[PDB]
Amino acid sequence: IPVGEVRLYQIADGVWSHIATQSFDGAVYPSNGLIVRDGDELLLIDTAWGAKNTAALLAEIEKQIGLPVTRAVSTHFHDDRVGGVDVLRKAGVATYASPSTRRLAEAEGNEIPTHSLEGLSSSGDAVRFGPVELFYPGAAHSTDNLVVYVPSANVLYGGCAVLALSRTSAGNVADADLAEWPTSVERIQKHYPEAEVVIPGHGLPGGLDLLQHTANVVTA
């Protein structure tokens, strides 16, 4: 609706989604990310799409949860996922991404997470990272995109590889692999068959049906 606002809400015990709005090429869009508690610390999944928005997110997190963000992971190299990494670093947060994501961000002119994730090289690879599992499903919205599962809550965060139910277009496919995308969605289906909440990269949370909806949109 209005640009530059940031909110959080509860998904499960120790799991929240953050939502922010931003202006892009003459239009305003919402965008989602995740927050996961690990003891008395927080793990952040993806920026809030810009420096100003990311600084507001840290202030909302401090007022509403009150535990420190110590680590952050960006799930691909575009600005809605890394824009704000420099604010996070100045706040003392350790920032991470795959090596391919870090190289692509630099090619693009974007902010670059400091540390490289290990073990995510081929389609189907998965690694534990504190309270979440990180999965590379294959190329989809981009060749580097990751998805994130929370075993304690049975929640799947699909990022920009998963479209909301209300979407009719795949959007910016400049870096997409439309030929591979359906296969990558099937890999998620088969790896996390039991997930009961699926959070897309933009729009309302849904169920596993979002994976088949995504396939349908991307095919057309």
Ligand SMILES: O=C(N[C@H](Cc1c[nH]c2ccccc12)C(=O)O)c1nc(Cl)c2ccccc2c1O
């Ligand atoms: O075309 C989009 N959306 C329309 C409208 C829509 C339905 N449901 C939505 C839920 C959220 C945002 C837009 C919608 C759709 O698919 O019919 C679209 N959406 C987003 Cl996010 C984009 C983000 C970044 C760059 C381009 C984008 C984009 O083109």
Ligand SMILES: [Zn+2]
């Ligand atoms: Zn993107």
Ligand SMILES: [Zn+2]
């Ligand atoms: Zn996106």
